[PDB]
Amino acid sequence: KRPPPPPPG
């Protein structure tokens, strides 16, 4: 699976 998105800035 794709990597998780980083927490929002």
Next chain:
Amino acid sequence: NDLGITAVALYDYQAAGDDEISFDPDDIITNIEMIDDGWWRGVCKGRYGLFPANYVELRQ
């Protein structure tokens, strides 16, 4: 425990697949399964699926 491992959503997340779930900050995720450092499996507002582990904070 019926709710098993629980957590609280830190940020908004929109499911980008039918295998994922969505939540708003402060939402509660239950019956969590830490399957890997990226995506976890759990339940949120009646929806069963994957979500970013880093978008929630474990809280019993």
Next chain:
Amino acid sequence: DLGITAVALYDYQAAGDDEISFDPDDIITNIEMIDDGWWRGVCKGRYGLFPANYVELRQ
């Protein structure tokens, strides 16, 4: 004109109005790397933030 461009690697749904959505193979143009984790740019007429790790730079 299209500035720094990239192609979407994965599906991503905007979490908010400040963010943009895209599907694999979509093109993101005029990219602003306002951060190592979150870039900004245009995709399918929309402007906003997206995960830098979700796209691959390609001119």
